[PDB]
Design a protein around this ligand. Structure first.
Ligand SMILES: [Zn+2]
Ligand SMILES: [Zn+2]
Lengths: 1035, 524
């Protein structure tokens, strides 16, 4: 071409090549994110013919119109039921970034492998084919302004891209996060019908004559014999309810009222979280009993306690028709106790009737009595007596015994310190020439952790008659000053241990109802070991060394009167481990030895091999492994010994949810995709191996996928499979992590074991990222967590995660550098270790483009600063090209003009009903063009290009840091680099000795995908508690 | 029969005088009397043997087996000579060796007068030990032991302690029990018997006493409690200079409860320097050597710095003296570059300019750091080299934050050679020269800048090359000379004498993109 027109021809060829790369990349996969698209574009080698250095985000952001038009044209020709190629999250993000209007021109080309099948076992296939019956049961119009919508005649060529995008946004968003949605009320609370029976009479004599109006019988006749233990169906008043079935636990004649009987209600599976997926003939036990008259007795029903087989461990894989014998399913049956408050499935309670109450015992009555007595705060032992108060030595509450001398948790409002404690600018109008985007800036906080005290005495105030009042109990408490609460204030806690406490002499008086838990507070010198071991020895352990004087604001020595099994580790199979975060957390818990692992991704398997020398990793897809195990082989293709029946004890994993990531109601295509996904394969693994403990981890939206259908189906499979199941949501940042990432956790325990409780929160976190509740079938479900936005330890921030790392600049690739400094906080002290002369590893960051480097060099260091503070200053870049100043060529009505009268619009799109003007777009500018082009529609893109806050936290997991991504801020708080691989690993809580593998991007992905080990350790501790209890039972 | 013997170490009461620490004596600061004795020998035989060997009557000495307690203390214990007299020592020690015994005798100057060893009732008597603390000299004085009934009241012992310690009688005394290191418990009530007054009363407990006197508030340790506190946290640290190889260092006594400022002040005093001109290094902990450097703001104590030493191991701490204040030293940027010397040899150097300074400051540091030519220019320059090709010269006004952080970028500092300092601009031209074997991609060797005249006898350039290199005069011959531009290279015949600047400058007005360069071919 001509030299004058050479740049334009080169730009056109660049457009062709970027469109071709984008279209083939989208052919390769349909689940990539915007960062993946940017990496694929950058890694592409420019052609020999075209004189282009390398494609960067500026090239994509300037050719967005053409590439998006070409991609829409690709899928606009051949239309199928599959999702259109331009609804991919990467490309949706790209459209949202650059102001591209969809549905114009197109069709400019001028006339231009298998569904697979998961190796599900007989049982899981039975469940899914059973649910296959009900999946067939079966606002936001076209925009009308875009060309395709304006074209005359839904049609495959008339699928409104804007409508599809809004539908996809609804699919990704949670519809809807209404907090209320009131908590479910008690079930069967309505009235029941009265039945007209012919004759009812007792048989025999009064079995038990209590001496009151109640005379207890055993056998009744209502045209049919009824004894104690027989089940009765009752028809209630018609309120869209099925017939209730209740076990008659006691029947008696009342001298005052009519003929009585106590019924312990069953509960049908349809009334639980199981919903329609439950077997109609299956029932569950509940804590719902009530005494009625036998006048409402409708009929007699027969139920069977389908107890698990004595050889339940080896029953997996067997055909259920072989075990179907016999007479099933014909009558009602129950196998699992159900708690609806926490959505917990357990084995039936083993409470045993007493001889005196043998013919009256109701398990619901006994459980309710135990729960009511346990919750009541009562005092135990009297010590000494005064004229106004009486002194005790111990007290009990919620199954916890507090004596004198144990550390006590108190709510933050219980008492205040005697120190003054909390003791209480504006720049000039910035140069709109030099800061032309400051106007877009403008025009809950994490609560304090638990107060900790030490009991000095327990006392009760004497009543008017002089008797002690056991309804209320008062506690006198010596306060403990945290370093945060000291006169040094917040900067004192940067280097202080997360455990450190200061002894005081001020005393407080609190009500025993305010007590929230027992913690062990102890001296440091009287410790029989190093303070580190005691801190790691057990939960809620605090140590104090020097006392604090508030009036003198000084530190002194504490006064003298302030001084005072291992089970075998379960063999573990870890499916889809990745780099092994969950396995490392369980190892830190000391409960699991991971003897196998499955991972298709090669770098993750290499990392697992490096971190776990004594483990075997099968780098083949799990379906092949399971099929080989079923067929009976002992060695795979490479000769690695597959585990067999009984080898697996704990099965843990998290399967990817790419196939069923939508949140609309199920569709035959989506359900067919689900039926052979990886989660069904993992459930088949649990069915075959029958592990003692079963753990499913996933993202939060796993709970509410397809209107909770994935969760309901998984729970149904677990229940049918004979397990004890529970589910919940855990916020990672509450367990020693400086990151907000909510995770859905499904726990299952084998019959004869104890179902683990969810771990209690440790570090207090901001309430905006602690919504752990769940909405299923218009019902609100909560985990068994009792700590609500409070905890013993303070929050963990970025300053405690990445402060001590030596400064490195952009593009650093030195794998092995020196630490060059002692750790400055508790988190980094714990992560580094005890031995101190290592070499810091993998402290590398991505080498961004020159334009991005200049932009993120010019971002100020003030907290919360983002692109809106970028100065429009002509700046030389590293490569030698020119970053021209961004020009304003239009006026926007919605925001007005500047104080200096300068224009604020960037494109003709600011005016309502005006299409974006071509050739008005600018590129290679310090302030990006797209951000002011489309700020108004996306809340000014707040947080884009921003820096981390030294007191804040990561927005989410950072799989691949990019300034223009949806993973929140990724710029380092002080230096001009993105967060490094080691910084990302420190965010997840990985030990500094943990080894990664691959190039920088693979290391970033490994760090991002893995579960934070501090979260896994907290869960691992809870599992160990049930390991103890089952072993403790043996006597 | 060496496995049948044991070492029995006798310590006398004269060894108790002068001890300034906890319990009775310092295990290191004590002279024993060692006995090699058969395990099957009876204790009575040993009591006879000691009494005869050391020159005492057997009924004038008492044996108090040195027994370790749960709290970590080591105190004298009770042994019954009569009842237990026929049992072997190896069963009495419970598999302990060496075996220390306190020998309680009558003072020979009070024994020559006829006094004998008092009787001791195990149920109703107790052995109390008395120490006197003097705040003015801040020291302990051993005041012997006493027999006393358990039920006796402290007030009846006050006259005894007074006249036993040399105090004027009826002097008000403050009493403490030294239960263990870091545990000194004041006795609040003197009107109660010893049983009630002293928790867990055993033989060998020690009560420390001092005058009750207002002058104590002028002392920095008014009471024995604070004395034992300061003693509990005192520790001797060996400071060593990291520059001196195998420097034995000097020992300073400090308190564990000390921050960075106080330690630095102390060391600076014992070193006659400003505290700010010192940087400290914690030990690597298991090995002996300098570890992680310590920042100036470190908010810790001495125990954190010494925590990975065993109590037996010597606790060492490294340091170095600075020529500049520690804050500016912590804000220095490590800049690794290559220094070219007079001999045309590369040296690795690391400089620490201020992170915000300019290239000028770097060159000034190197000038303060180096020596210049015999009588050359004395002016240095900074080249930036990639792929053994000079990709730029950095002007001394360039910002240090503006320099290529990439590892392929190598910064060289060099003295301009005499025939390159001031050259003739419209005739002589500096050309970039590099080596390569076979093809031009695999470059190697030391690249260089070469002067070229105008219309100059290309074999003049080859005798200049020969004059620079200076290998034997044949091996020069295999050099293949080529002109390389954007990857293309045309080889040039040495004896043809083809030279002029135009075939070395890029197109008119061109700088930004690569300039023609000279290529040499031979094998390495
Ligand atoms: Zn009941
Ligand atoms: Zn526009």
């Amino acid at each position: 071409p001509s030299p004058e027109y050479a740049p334009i021809f080169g730009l056109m060829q660049e457009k062709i090549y970027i469109s071709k790369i984008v279209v083939e990349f989208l052919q390769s996969n349909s689940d990539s994110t915007y960062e993946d698209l940017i990496n694929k574009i950058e890694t592409t080698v420019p052609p020999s013919g075209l004189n282009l250095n390398r494609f960067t985000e500026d090239s994509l952001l300037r050719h967005a119109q053409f590439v998006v038009e070409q991609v829409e044209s690709y899928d606009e020709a051949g239309d199928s039921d599959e999702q259109p190629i331009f609804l991919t999250p990467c490309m949706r993000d790209l459209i949202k970034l650059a102001g591209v209007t969809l549905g114009q021109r197109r069709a400019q080309a001028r006339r231009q492998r298998g569904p697979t099948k998961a190796t599900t076992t007989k049982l899981v296939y039975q469940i899914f084919d059973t649910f296959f019956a009900e999946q067939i049961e079966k606002k936001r119009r076209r925009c009308g302004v875009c060309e395709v919508c304006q074209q005359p005649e839904a049609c495959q060529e008339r699928r409104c891209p804007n409508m599809a995008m809004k539908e996809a946004d609804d699919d990704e968003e949670v519809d809807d996060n209404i907090p209320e949605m009131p908590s479910p009320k008690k079930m069967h609370q309505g009235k029941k019908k009265k039945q007209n029976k012919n004759r009812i009479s007792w048989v025999g004599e009064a079995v038990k004559t209590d001496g009151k109006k109640s005379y207890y019988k055993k056998v009744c006749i209502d045209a049919e014999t009824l004894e104690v233990g027989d089940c009765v169906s009752v028809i209630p008043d018609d309120s869209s309810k099925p017939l209730y079935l209740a076990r008659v636990t006691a029947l008696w004649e009342d001298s005052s009222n009519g003929q009585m009987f106590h019924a312990h209600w069953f509960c049908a599976g349809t009334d639980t979280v199981l919903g329609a997926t439950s077997d109609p003939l299956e029932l569950f036990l509940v804590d719902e009993c009530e005494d009625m008259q036998l006048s409402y007795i409708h009929s007699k029903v027969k139920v069977i306690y389908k107890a698990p087989s004595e050889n339940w461990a080896m029953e997996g894989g067997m055909d259920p028709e072989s075990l179907l014998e016999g007479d099933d399913g014909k009558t009602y049956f129950y196998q699992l106790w159900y708690d609806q408050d926490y959505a917990r499935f357990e084995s039936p309670p083993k409470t045993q009737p007493t001889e005196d109450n043998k013919f009256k015992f109701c398990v619901s009555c006994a459980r309710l009595a135990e729960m009511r007595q346990k919750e009541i705060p009562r005092v135990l032992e009297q010590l000494e007596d005064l004229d106004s108060r009486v002194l005790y030595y111990s007290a009990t509450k919620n199954g916890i015994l507090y004596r004198v001398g144990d550390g006590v948790y108190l709510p933050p409002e219980a008492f205040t310190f005697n120190i003054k404690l909390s003791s209480p600018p504006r720049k000039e109008p910035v140069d709109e020439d030099l800061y032309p985007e400051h106007y877009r800036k403008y025009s809950l906080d994490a609560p304090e952790p638990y107060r900790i005290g030490r009991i000095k005495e327990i006392f009760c105030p004497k009543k008017s008659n002089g008797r002690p009042n056991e309804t209320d109990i008062k506690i006198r408490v010596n306060k403990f000053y945290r370093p945060e609460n000291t006169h040094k204030s917040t900067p004192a806690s940067y280097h202080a241990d997360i455990n450190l406490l200061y002894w005081s002499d001020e005393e407080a008086v609190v009500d025993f109802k305010a007590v929230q838990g027992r913690c062990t507070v102890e001296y440091g010198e009287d410790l029989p070991e190093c303070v580190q071991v005691y801190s790691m020895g057990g939960p809620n352990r605090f140590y104090f060394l020097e006392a604090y004087n508030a009036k003198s604001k000084s530190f002194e020595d504490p006064p003298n009167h302030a001084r005072s099994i291992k089970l075998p580790k379960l063999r573990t199979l870890d499916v889809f481990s990745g780099c092994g975060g969950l396995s490392e957390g369980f190892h830190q818990a000391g409960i699991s030895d991971t003897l196998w692992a499955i991972e298709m991704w090669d770098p993750a398997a290499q990392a697992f091999r490096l971190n776990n020398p004594g483990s075997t990793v099968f780098t083949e897809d799990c379906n092949i492994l399971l099929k080989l195990v079923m067929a009976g082989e002992t060695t795979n293709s490479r000769g690695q010994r597959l585990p067999q029946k009984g080898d697996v004890e704990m099965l843990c994993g998290g399967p990817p949810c790419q196939g069923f990531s939508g949140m609309n109601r199920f569709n035959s295509r989506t359900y067919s995709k689900f039926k052979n996904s990886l989660v069904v394969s993992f459930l088949s693994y649990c069915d075959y191996y029958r592990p003692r403990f079963f753990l499913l981890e996933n993202v939060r939206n796993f709970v509410s996928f397809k209107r909770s259908m994935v969760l309901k189906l998984t729970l149904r499979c677990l229940v049918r499979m004979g397990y004890q199941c529970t589910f919940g949501v855990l916020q990672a940042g509450q367990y020693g992590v400086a990151q907000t990432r909510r995770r859905a956790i499904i726990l299952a325990a084998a019959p004869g074991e104890k179902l683990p409780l969810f771990p209690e929160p440790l570090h207090v976190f901001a309430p905006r990222a602690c919504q752990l509740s769940v909405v299923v079938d218009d019902k609100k479900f909560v985990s068994n967590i009792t700590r609500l936005s409070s905890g013993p330890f303070r929050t963990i921030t970025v300053r405690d995660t990445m402060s001590d790392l030596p400064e490195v600049r952009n593009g650093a690739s030195a794998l092995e550098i020196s630490y060059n400094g002692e750790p400055q906080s508790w988190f980094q002290r714990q992560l580094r270790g005890a031995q101190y002369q290592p070499i810091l590893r993998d402290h590398i960051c991505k080498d961004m483009s020159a334009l991005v480097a200049a932009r993120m060099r010019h971002i100020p260091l003030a907290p919360g600063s983002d692109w809106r503070d970028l100065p429009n200053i002509e700046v030389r870049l590293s490569d030698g090209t020119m970053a021209r100043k961004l020009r304003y060529t239009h006026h926007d009505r919605k925001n007005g003009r500047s104080s200096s009268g300068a224009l604020r619009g960037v494109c003709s799109c600011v005016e309502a009903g005006k299409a974006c003007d071509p050739a008005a777009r600018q590129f290679n500018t310090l302030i990006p063009w797209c951000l002011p082009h489309t700020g108004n529609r996306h809340n000014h893109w707040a947080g884009l290009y921003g820096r981390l806050e030294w007191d804040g936290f990561f927005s989410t997991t950072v799989t691949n840091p990019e300034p223009m991504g949806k993973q929140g801020r990724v710029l380092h708080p002080e230096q001009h680099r993105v967060v490094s691989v080691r910084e990302c690993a420190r965010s997840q809580g990985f030990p500094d000795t943990y080894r990664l593998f691959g190039n920088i991007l693979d290391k970033h992905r490994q760090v991002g995908n893995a579960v934070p080990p501090p979260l896994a350790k907290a869960i691992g501790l809870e599992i160990k508690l049930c390991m103890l209890a089952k072993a403790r039972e043996s006597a | 029969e060496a496995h049948l013997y044991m070492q029995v170490q006798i310590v006398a009461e004269d060894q108790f005088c002068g001890h300034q620490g906890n319990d009775m004596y310092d295990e290191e600061k004590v002279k024993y009397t060692v006995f090699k004795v058969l395990k099957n020998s009876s204790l009575a035989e040993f009591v006879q043997s000691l009494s005869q060997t050391m020159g005492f009557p057997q009924d004038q000495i008492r044996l108090w087996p040195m027994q370790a307690r749960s709290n970590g203390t080591k105190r004298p214990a009770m042994l019954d000579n009569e009842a237990d007299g026929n049992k072997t020592m190896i069963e009495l020690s419970d598999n302990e060796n060496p075996w220390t015994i306190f020998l309680e005798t009558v003072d020979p100057e009070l024994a020559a007068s006829g006094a004998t060893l008092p009787k001791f009732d195990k149920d109703h008597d107790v052995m109390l030990f008395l120490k006197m603390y003097d705040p003015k000299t801040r020291s302990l004085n051993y005041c012997g032991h006493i027999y006393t009934p358990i039920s006796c009241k402290i007030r009846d012992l006050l006259p005894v302690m007074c006249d036993r310690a040399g105090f004027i009688q009826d002097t008000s005394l403050i009493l403490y029990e030294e239960v263990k290191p870091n545990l000194t418990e004041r006795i609040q009530d003197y009107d109660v018997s010893l049983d009630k007054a002293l928790d867990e009363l055993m033989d060998g407990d020690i009560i420390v006493f001092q005058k009750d006197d207002p002058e104590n508030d002028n002392s920095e340790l008014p009471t024995a409690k604070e004395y034992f506190r300061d003693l509990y946290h005192r520790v001797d640290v060996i400071f060593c200079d990291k520059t001196i190889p195998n420097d034995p260092g000097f020992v300073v006594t400090l308190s564990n409860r000390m921050n960075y400022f106080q330690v630095a002040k102390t060391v600076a005093q014992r070193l006659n320097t400003d505290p700010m001109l010192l940087q400290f290094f914690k030990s690597q902990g298991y090995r002996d050597g300098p570890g992680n450097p310590l920042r100036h703001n470190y908010e810790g104590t001495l125990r954190d710095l010494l925590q990975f030493f065993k109590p037996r191991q010597p606790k060492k701490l490294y340091y170095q003296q600075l020529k500049m204040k520690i804050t500016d030293f912590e804000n220095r940027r490590s800049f690794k570059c290559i220094w070219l010397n007079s001999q045309f040899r590369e040296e690795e150097i690391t400089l620490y300019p201020d992170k915000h300074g300019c290239v000028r400051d770097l060159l000034e540091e190197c000038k303060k750091a180096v020596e210049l030519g015999e009588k050359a220019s004395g002016k240095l320059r900074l080249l930036e080299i990639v792929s053994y090709k000079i990709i730029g010269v950095h002007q001394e006004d360039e910002l240090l934050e503006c320099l290529s952080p990439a590892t392929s970028r190598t910064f060289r500092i060099e003295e301009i050679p005499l025939d390159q300092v001031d050259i003739d601009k419209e005739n002589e031209m500096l050309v970039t020269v590099a080596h390569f074997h076979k093809e031009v991609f695999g470059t190697f060797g030391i690249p260089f800048l070469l002067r070229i005249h105008q219309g100059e006898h290309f074999r003049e350039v080859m005798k200049r090359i020969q004059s620079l290199l200076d290998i034997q005069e044949k091996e020069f011959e295999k050099f293949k000379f080529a002109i390389v531009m954007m990857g293309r290279h045309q080889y040039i015949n040495e004896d043809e004498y083809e030279v002029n600047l135009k075939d070395f400058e890029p197109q008119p007005g061109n700088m930004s993109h690569p300039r023609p360069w000279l290529g040499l071919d031979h094998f390495n």
